Amino acid sequence: SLFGAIAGFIENGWEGMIDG
């Protein structure tokens, strides 16, 4: 899903971007 394309990026790349 588009939500998948959102959240599934976050499910790795989130933690380098928390301070956003």
Side-chain angles (χ1 to χ4, degrees):
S1 57
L2 197 139
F3 211 91
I6 296 172
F9 137 70
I10 266 164
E11 288 168 67
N12 276 200
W14 182 27
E15 295 186 271
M17 301 299 302
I18 285 276
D19 310 70

